[PDB]
């Protein structure tokens, strides 16, 4: 007889941090 | 025989959100 | 007769990568 299936594999990796968001709007004129 | 190979690990874990935005351009003088 | 369990599987997936951040603030005034 066939031996029982081995166990699960390790979970996988993080993914990467998210992008940084755009630069913000320019300011108000003095 | 030898057993099956085991399944593959769970899926890895989410990056984080990224970073807020740089602040924008200082505005026009006054 | 049985034969031996099987070997670990392979490692899951990569987790999904982070979400981009917020649009930084507004520039400060002139």
Same mark, same amino acid.
């Given at each position: 007889?066939? %031996? #029982?299936?081995?166990?699960? =594999? #390790?979970?996988?990796?993080? %993914?990467?941090?998210?992008?940084?968001?755009?630069? %913000?709007?320019?300011?108000?004129?003095? | 025989?030898?057993?099956?190979?085991? #399944?593959?690990?769970?899926?890895? #874990?989410? %990056?984080?959100?990224?970073?807020?935005?740089?602040? =924008?351009?200082?505005?026009?003088?006054?």
């Amino acid at each position: 007889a066939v %031996g #029982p299936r081995g166990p699960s =594999g #390790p979970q996988g990796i993080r %993914g990467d941090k998210g992008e940084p968001g755009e630069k %913000g709007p320019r300011g108000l004129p003095g | 025989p030898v057993g099956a190979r085991g #399944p593959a690990g769970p899926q890895g #874990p989410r %990056g984080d959100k990224g970073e807020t935005g740089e602040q =924008g351009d200082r505005g026009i003088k006054g």
